[PDB]
Write a protein that binds this ligand. Sequence first.
Ligand SMILES: [Mg+2]
Ligand SMILES: [Mg+2]
Ligand SMILES: [Mg+2]
Ligand SMILES: [Mg+2]
Ligand SMILES: [Mg+2]
Lengths: 275, 283
Amino acid sequence: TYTTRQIGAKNTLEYKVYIEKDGKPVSAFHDIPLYADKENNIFNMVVEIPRWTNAKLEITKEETLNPIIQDTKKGKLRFVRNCFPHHGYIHNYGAFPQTWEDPNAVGDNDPIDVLEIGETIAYTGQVKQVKALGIMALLDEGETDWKVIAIDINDPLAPKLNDIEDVEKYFPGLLRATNEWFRIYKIPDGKPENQFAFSGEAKNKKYALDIIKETHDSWKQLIAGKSSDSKGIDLTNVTLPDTPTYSKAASDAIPPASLKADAPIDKSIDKWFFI
Amino acid sequence: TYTTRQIGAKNTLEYKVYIEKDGKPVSAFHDIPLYADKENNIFNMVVEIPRWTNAKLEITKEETLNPIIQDTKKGKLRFVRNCFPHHGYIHNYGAFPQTWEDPNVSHPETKAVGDNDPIDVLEIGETIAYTGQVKQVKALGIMALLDEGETDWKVIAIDINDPLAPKLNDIEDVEKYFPGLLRATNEWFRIYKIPDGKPENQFAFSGEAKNKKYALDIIKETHDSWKQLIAGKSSDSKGIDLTNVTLPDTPTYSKAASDAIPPASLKADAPIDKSIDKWFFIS
Ligand SMILES: [Mg+2]
Ligand SMILES: [Mg+2]
Ligand SMILES: [Mg+2]
Ligand SMILES: [Mg+2]
Ligand SMILES: [Mg+2]
């Protein structure tokens, strides 16, 4: 059973979320199997950011057991601003564990990103089981920043969704909103409009699976200690006994759950930008 | 100074929010002056529903001092559903006090009776409001919604404290600083009850947002209708509770009514059923 352990108050620099397996912290990057059901391509997704929230939460590669923390720049907590007509993130946003876009266009140096499109709003550190529907390629300064489009297998519509064309049928306009969102979401931060490969097209399930599998193989090399360069990445794990960086003690070293209410978010984050 | 008195937990059947002045409840419908500054047309808006929320909180016409209570259907709490690409209400949503959409006459602009409620207000500023807030707003324009066949004007307004307020003086300024918002507003009010199994709504004037001058004229009409109502002179007051604590020349004045309201019993927000998360794709 996967649960979460929160350290610190939400919306502060101290906030960290660890994933627990049967009460014990594990690495959110390395210890959660990519596949819930390999034969049927059911993936575990680690959720970082709930739909319609603003705080830019991410698995941190550099801290032991890779908790989810809020992104910072020069000491300041980072938020996505509201970009009309959107409110925060428009997907449950996260990543596949045991994947890595090896930067050694080029890998983006993180687990492959996942947009989960189902009805229910997720929680930070949730491990849910999803099926892949397709994939888009956002460009980020020469890096290929893939966005997998997926749905929770427990979603009421999941049986009716198998490939990318089904997203057009049951979620008309969501692909367009996705294109627009990733194009404009940094404009309020003083950055340019972003660009997609393939003229913004979403490639199909088959294509997505090939990319996901490649990033899993890269992670296999990484965790084995065999990548050409893993600088800045903590590979400590508590479930892979034959890896050089196995250390069960790392689980015990994590502090207990925080006793704290969410810190308030500055009211400026409410603002709707027309851009 | 206006404050709020909350009974119970938000998102429960027991929840009520009374507006207080001097720590004592007043009628949210009748006792809050329409104008904060009459000569400059600065209005008091009673906020019901914050932007990006779902619970259909409303001033309760039939309850003494007209607290804000969540609407219900078959006894179950009513939440407006998320209609793609929107999340809940896309404005801070509320009403002008001391107004009434007269249900006993056909309104000439729409050829329909009024919806029996205070005139509704869409406040477009950056900050998300709170339920029971009294804020001061300028009117910018107005849209002639027919909501389930009833005259249901929507005033477009902005909080006078918004950073952009000085630059927003008439409806054309809304399109300049909030491009796409008026078009989205038209869509929202057309489609928002389709997930409830109701028809699409429609607008008069093909959804045109009429200007500030037009808005002031309609606001005046609805204030005049309320003046008749509160005097006990409506042909049919629809069981509305006209009890008030600030209008001595009215038959239903009673300073005592305030003392009869229970004390605050504020509880943490109750959870909302996960179904309310759902995003509906209407076409
Ligand atoms: Mg990522
Ligand atoms: Mg990426
Ligand atoms: Mg109603
Ligand atoms: Mg109303
Ligand atoms: Mg109305």
